[PDB]
Write an enzyme that holds these catalytic residues in place. Sequence first.
Site, PDB file in Angstrom:
ATOM      1  CG  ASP A  58      -5.412  -0.222  -1.220  1.00 52.77           C
ATOM      2  OD1 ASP A  58      -6.506  -0.663  -1.653  1.00 52.77           O
ATOM      3  OD2 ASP A  58      -5.309   0.900  -0.644  1.00 52.77           O
ATOM      4  CG  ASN A  59      -4.657   2.069  -3.622  1.00 50.77           C
ATOM      5  OD1 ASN A  59      -3.834   2.049  -2.691  1.00 50.77           O
ATOM      6  ND2 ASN A  59      -5.875   2.582  -3.490  1.00 50.77           N
ATOM      7  CE  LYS A 108      -1.000   3.194  -4.133  1.00 46.11           C
ATOM      8  NZ  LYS A 108      -0.924   2.526  -2.785  1.00 46.11           N
ATOM      9  CD  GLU A 131      -8.424   4.823  -0.196  1.00 48.32           C
ATOM     10  OE1 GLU A 131      -8.712   3.761  -0.805  1.00 48.32           O
ATOM     11  OE2 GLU A 131      -7.247   5.255  -0.094  1.00 48.32           O
ATOM     12  CG  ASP A 146      -2.034   1.032   1.118  1.00 45.58           C
ATOM     13  OD1 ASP A 146      -2.451   1.373  -0.026  1.00 45.58           O
ATOM     14  OD2 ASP A 146      -2.553   1.455   2.172  1.00 45.58           O
TER      15      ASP A 146
HETATM   16  O1  LIG Z   1      -0.514   6.665  -3.496  1.00 43.57           O
HETATM   17  C1  LIG Z   1      -1.096   6.102  -2.561  1.00 43.57           C
HETATM   18  N1  LIG Z   1      -0.398   5.556  -1.567  1.00 43.57           N
HETATM   19  C2  LIG Z   1       1.053   5.584  -1.500  1.00 43.57           C
HETATM   20  C3  LIG Z   1       1.635   6.842  -0.886  1.00 43.57           C
HETATM   21  C4  LIG Z   1       1.227   8.115  -1.300  1.00 43.57           C
HETATM   22  C5  LIG Z   1       1.834   9.245  -0.759  1.00 43.57           C
HETATM   23  C6  LIG Z   1       2.841   9.081   0.189  1.00 43.57           C
HETATM   24  C7  LIG Z   1       3.261   7.825   0.595  1.00 43.57           C
HETATM   25  C8  LIG Z   1       4.366   7.719   1.634  1.00 43.57           C
HETATM   26  N2  LIG Z   1       4.439   6.363   2.238  1.00 43.57           N
HETATM   27  C9  LIG Z   1       5.400   5.461   1.793  1.00 43.57           C
HETATM   28  C10 LIG Z   1       5.924   5.589   0.499  1.00 43.57           C
HETATM   29  C11 LIG Z   1       6.914   4.777   0.064  1.00 43.57           C
HETATM   30  C12 LIG Z   1       7.414   3.774   0.898  1.00 43.57           C
HETATM   31  N3  LIG Z   1       8.451   2.881   0.757  1.00 43.57           N
HETATM   32  N4  LIG Z   1       8.528   2.150   1.922  1.00 43.57           N
HETATM   33  C13 LIG Z   1       7.587   2.528   2.756  1.00 43.57           C
HETATM   34  C14 LIG Z   1       6.853   3.615   2.209  1.00 43.57           C
HETATM   35  C15 LIG Z   1       5.793   4.441   2.653  1.00 43.57           C
HETATM   36  C16 LIG Z   1       2.639   6.713   0.064  1.00 43.57           C
HETATM   37  C17 LIG Z   1      -2.589   6.024  -2.530  1.00 43.57           C
HETATM   38  C18 LIG Z   1      -3.265   6.944  -3.298  1.00 43.57           C
HETATM   39  C19 LIG Z   1      -4.642   6.953  -3.357  1.00 43.57           C
HETATM   40  C20 LIG Z   1      -5.372   7.969  -4.168  1.00 43.57           C
HETATM   41  C21 LIG Z   1      -4.925   9.273  -4.245  1.00 43.57           C
HETATM   42  C22 LIG Z   1      -5.622  10.205  -4.967  1.00 43.57           C
HETATM   43  C23 LIG Z   1      -6.758   9.839  -5.634  1.00 43.57           C
HETATM   44  F1  LIG Z   1      -7.422  10.773  -6.352  1.00 43.57           F
HETATM   45  C24 LIG Z   1      -7.234   8.535  -5.629  1.00 43.57           C
HETATM   46  C25 LIG Z   1      -6.512   7.620  -4.865  1.00 43.57           C
HETATM   47  C26 LIG Z   1      -5.347   5.958  -2.637  1.00 43.57           C
HETATM   48  C27 LIG Z   1      -4.675   5.023  -1.863  1.00 43.57           C
HETATM   49  O2  LIG Z   1      -5.352   4.063  -1.191  1.00 43.57           O
HETATM   50  C28 LIG Z   1      -3.259   5.027  -1.807  1.00 43.57           C
HETATM   51  O3  LIG Z   1      -2.668   4.055  -1.062  1.00 43.57           O
HETATM   52 CL   LIG Z   2     -14.955   3.144   2.416  1.00 45.54          CL
HETATM   53 CL   LIG Z   3      -4.404   2.483   5.658  1.00 49.03          CL
HETATM   54 MG   LIG Z   4      -4.066   2.509  -0.610  1.00 49.88          MG
END
Ligand SMILES: O=C(NCc1cccc(CNc2ccc3[nH]ncc3c2)c1)c1cc(-c2ccc(F)cc2)cc(O)c1O
Ligand SMILES: [Cl-]
Ligand SMILES: [Cl-]
Ligand SMILES: [Mg+2]
EC number: 2.1.1.6
Length: 213
Positions: free
Chosen positions: A167-168, A142, A197, A139
């Site tokens: 996810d996603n 991506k 979500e 998650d």
């Molecule tokens: O992009 C997403 N998630 C990833 C994410 C995103 C930002 C920051 C981090 C920083 N955390 C991180 C990163 C890299 C890492 N490497 N190791 C650990 C680690 C931890 C992670 C996401 C987006 C949407 C979404 C957005 C917009 C929209 F319109 C529709 C849907 C929905 C989701 O459910 C999502 O999960």
């Molecule tokens: Cl939901």
């Molecule tokens: Cl979560």
């Molecule tokens: Mg997600």
Amino acid sequence: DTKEQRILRYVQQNAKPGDPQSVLEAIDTYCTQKEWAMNVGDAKGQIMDAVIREYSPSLVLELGAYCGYSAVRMARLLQPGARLLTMEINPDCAAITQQMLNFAGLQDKVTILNGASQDLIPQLKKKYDVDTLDMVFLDHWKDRYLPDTLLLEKCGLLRKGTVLLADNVIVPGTPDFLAYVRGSSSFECTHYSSYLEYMKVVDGLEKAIYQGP
Ligand SMILES: O=C(NCc1cccc(CNc2ccc3[nH]ncc3c2)c1)c1cc(-c2ccc(F)cc2)cc(O)c1O
Ligand SMILES: [Cl-]
Ligand SMILES: [Cl-]
Ligand SMILES: [Mg+2]
């Protein structure tokens, strides 16, 4: 003052300490009524719960904790002694996740690691005394789903039957990962169609069960 801090505060003021279900409900309420956030949410969360109950994994790795919603969701269903490791690159969010888990009373089941998956995965065996993983929840960014899956394999962390849950896979999408696992003899894949979500937008989870080399 950030959205993530506001979510944590809302939980602390609207949930019951030590009650994971109340924590999930508080987060889902806040994100429905006040500010959207990228928690896995209740629709996909229910599918996650069904998977966790089917497999009762003893050791789970999560990539991308965010505020700890999914970590609370999974950890509350783990059997006694079972453990979750979750990785989060953003230090502010790692701290929110630790506090979320503390509030939920799940801190003894979960280790929240502040760092990047590609740096931490190769340390799991020697530093975190992991042999192999029972389940992995993907998650994070991506574009990292595929490289980190391949890294997990290289590091000897997958066994026959390891469950990857991603996810996603529709929104934002993870096209390389999805093509790869669905085309590989080393994975048995199932798609669980759901909703993004807090939104009336189709999304889904992919389950990819590792089969060995
Ligand atoms: O992009 C997403 N998630 C990833 C994410 C995103 C930002 C920051 C981090 C920083 N955390 C991180 C990163 C890299 C890492 N490497 N190791 C650990 C680690 C931890 C992670 C996401 C987006 C949407 C979404 C957005 C917009 C929209 F319109 C529709 C849907 C929905 C989701 O459910 C999502 O999960
Ligand atoms: Cl939901
Ligand atoms: Cl979560
Ligand atoms: Mg997600």
